[PDB]
Each structure stands twice: as C-alpha cells, then as structure tokens.
Amino acid sequence: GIVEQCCTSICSLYQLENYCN
Amino acid sequence: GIVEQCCTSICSLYQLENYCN
Amino acid sequence: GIVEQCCTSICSLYQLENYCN
Amino acid sequence: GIVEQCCTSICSLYQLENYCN
Amino acid sequence: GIVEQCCTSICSLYQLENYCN
Amino acid sequence: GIVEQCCTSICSLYQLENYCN
Amino acid sequence: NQHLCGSHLVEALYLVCGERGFFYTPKT
Amino acid sequence: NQHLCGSHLVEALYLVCGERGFFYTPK
Amino acid sequence: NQHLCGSHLVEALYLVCGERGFFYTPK
Amino acid sequence: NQHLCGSHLVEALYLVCGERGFFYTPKT
Amino acid sequence: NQHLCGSHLVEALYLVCGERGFFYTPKT
Amino acid sequence: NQHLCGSHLVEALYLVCGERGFFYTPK
Ligand SMILES: COC(=O)c1ccc(O)cc1
Ligand SMILES: COC(=O)c1ccc(O)cc1
Ligand SMILES: COC(=O)c1ccc(O)cc1
Ligand SMILES: [Zn+2]
Ligand SMILES: [Zn+2]
Ligand SMILES: [Zn+2]
Ligand SMILES: [Zn+2]
Ligand SMILES: [Zn+2]
Ligand SMILES: [Zn+2]
Ligand SMILES: [Zn+2]
Ligand SMILES: [Zn+2]
Numbered sequence A, B, C, D, E, F: 001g002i003v004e005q006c007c008t009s010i011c012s013l014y015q016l017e018n019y020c021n
Numbered sequence G, J, K: 001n002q003h004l005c006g007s008h009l010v011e012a013l014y015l016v017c018g019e020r021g022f023f024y025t026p027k028t
Numbered sequence H, I, L: 001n002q003h004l005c006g007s008h009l010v011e012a013l014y015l016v017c018g019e020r021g022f023f024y025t026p027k
Helices: A002-007 A013-019 B002-008 B013-019 C002-007 C013-019 D002-008 D013-019 E002-008 E013-019 F002-007 F013-019 G006-020 H007-020 I007-020 J006-020 K006-020 L007-020
Strands: G022-024 H022-024 I022-024 J022-024 K022-024 L022-024
Touching: A002 A013, A002 J006, A013 J006, A013 J022, B002 B013, B002 L007, B013 L007, B013 L022, C002 C013, C002 G006, C013 G006, C013 G022, D002 D013, D002 I007, D013 I007, D013 I022, E002 E013, E002 H007, E013 H007, E013 H022, F002 F013, F002 K006, F013 K006, F013 K022, G006 G022, G006 H007, G006 H022, G006 I007, G022 H007, H007 H022, H007 K006, I007 I022, I007 J006, I007 J022, I022 J006, J006 J022, J006 L007, K006 K022, K006 L007, K006 L022, K022 L007, L007 L022
Parallel strands: none
Antiparallel strands: G022 H022, I022 J022, K022 L022
16 A cells, blocks of 8 residues: 555655556 | 757756766 | 635535626 | 547547446 | 646746735 | 744744855 | 545545635635 | 646635635636 | 646646545656 | 655556556545 | 745745755654 | 646655655756
C-alpha cells in the first residue's frame, strides 16, 4: 500500500516508482 | 537556465536535483 | 459555513455547489 | 483519451468519474 | 476583469487584495 | 529560519519577502 | 465524500463551480 | 506562457485574503 | 489557454475519486 | 525522503511516473 | 497573516518574490 | 502545452530537495 509506505510512513522517489504503470 | 529550460523544453527531476542545497 | 461542512466535517461535491454564485 | 481530452478540449468531473477504481 | 487580467496580462497581489471580503 | 517564522509560527507576506533574492 | 481545508477547499470550489464563480467565507 | 490562470488565481486569492475570505467571478 | 492539463488533471481525479482511488494513463 | 498524503502524494506520482502513468489505490 | 508549511510555503514564496527568485532553507 | 512552468517548478524542487532546501532564480 502506497499510503502506508509514503503517507503513514516516509518513502523515497524510487519507492514511488513502484506505483507507475 | 533550468527555470527556462523546464518551461521551454524537457526537464528531468535529476537535472532539478542540482538546485538543492 | 463551508468550513464546518467540509473542513471541520466531511462534505460532498453537491454540498460544495452551495457556495457557487 | 480523457487525459488528452481534458487538456485539448472540455472535461466534466462526471467524465473523470469513469477513471475511479 | 481581474480573472481575465491576471491570465491575459500582469497581476499584482496588491490588485488581488481588492477581491477579499 | 522561515520555518519557525511561517510554518511553526504565523507570518506575513512582508515577512516572506525576507527570503527573496 | 471529502475532508478539505484552506487552499485545497478553494481549488475544489473552483473545479465544481468553474464559470459560475464562488464565494469563500470561512468565518461565518 | 504566462502567470495566474484558473487554479493558480484562486490559490493566490487564498494567500492574499486568507481568513478574510474572497469572491471569485469571471466575466 | 485552457483547463485540466497535467498536474491539474490528477488533482481533479483525486477530488472526484478520493478513497476509491484512480488510474492515470495518457495515450 | 518524503511524507506525502492525499493530493500531494498523487502530484508526486505524476511527476515521477509521467508518461508511464500510475495507479493510486489508497485502500489496499 | 498565514500558517504555511512545505510545498504551500514554497508556492507562497514564488508568488511574493516572483522574478526576484528565492531561497528555501528549512533547516537553519 | 508543456510541463514544469512557474508554480509547478518550485513544487517539483520541493519534492526533489525537501529538507535539504533549494534556490530558485530565473534569468
Ligand atoms: C463525481 O461527479 C459528481 O458527482 C459531481 C458533482 C458535482 C459537480 O459539480 C460535478 C460532478
Ligand atoms: C532526485 O532525483 C531522483 O533520485 C529521482 C528518482 C526517481 C525518478 O523517477 C526521478 C528522479
Ligand atoms: C496583500 O498584498 C500585500 O500586502 C503584499 C505584500 C507583499 C508583496 O510582495 C505583495 C503584496
Ligand atoms: Zn498553484
Ligand atoms: Zn498549473
Ligand atoms: Zn498548488
Ligand atoms: Zn491544481
Ligand atoms: Zn494544487
Ligand atoms: Zn496541501
Ligand atoms: Zn502543481
Ligand atoms: Zn499543487
């Protein structure tokens, strides 16, 4: 879940890439 | 310049990283 | 008040229409 | 396509509702 | 009009202050 | 520090001018 | 449907109202 | 290419006005 | 001059969809 | 690297993915 | 006059400074 | 129609830089 990675926790720009198509 | 470059043509986030302190 | 409807509480897009001119 | 349609011409929020999960 | 003026030509935040309640 | 002036505390638009080049 | 405050609320009003325009009166 | 159009206008109004509030009406 | 382009499109999608979520794919 | 929620998270995804597109699925 | 953090603070600086440019140094 | 202009540029800078901070100066 992107929310638990990056909203509820802190995440990187490469972690955000996981959710690109 | 980057500000003009990003608006006039293509810009990558990698190129924008040069302007971080 | 829009704030008490939609900021302090949760509101819908039709509730936001109430504040259009 | 919707992304091109919204930018090239008119888009309603109703039309954008098709792209919700 | 201010909305058209800001988009068509130059706008200062001072000019936008006229539209505060 | 702009953060302690305007994020952690409340600041004015003339206080924001202090951080223009 | 949505929790919206400050500038996000205003952008939401712009989207929903559009040409109709709107009034943002947070105090009353 | 220009400046305060559409969404950006109402964001600038919120900044300038804030708790005072504001009216937005195009022509 | 127009309306929902790039960044503004995905902001409008979040508003309309919200907790439902959404997919974004240009052509 | 960054705390991002709601519309800010989505704008971040748009910037990083761009042409690739993305999916925002907050519930799962 | 306003409580501003993160990306909103930066957008505010852009609006007020504009052509003058600005520096965002949150740590000091 | 293009990409990172004006307001969107400084938002992308904040994302990329964050707590590091950044300088913004057009030509
Ligand atoms: C998600 O679509 C709507 O329900 C909607 C409601 C009010 C509008 O003005 C536009 C769309
Ligand atoms: C700050 O630059 C990056 O590390 C970066 C990471 C992922 C991208 O997609 C682009 C840039
Ligand atoms: C609301 O108008 C102002 O007071 C203002 C202050 C600083 C500026 O740079 C511009 C406008
Ligand atoms: Zn903006
Ligand atoms: Zn924009
Ligand atoms: Zn914004
Ligand atoms: Zn927007
Ligand atoms: Zn926005
Ligand atoms: Zn925000
Ligand atoms: Zn943006
Ligand atoms: Zn934004």
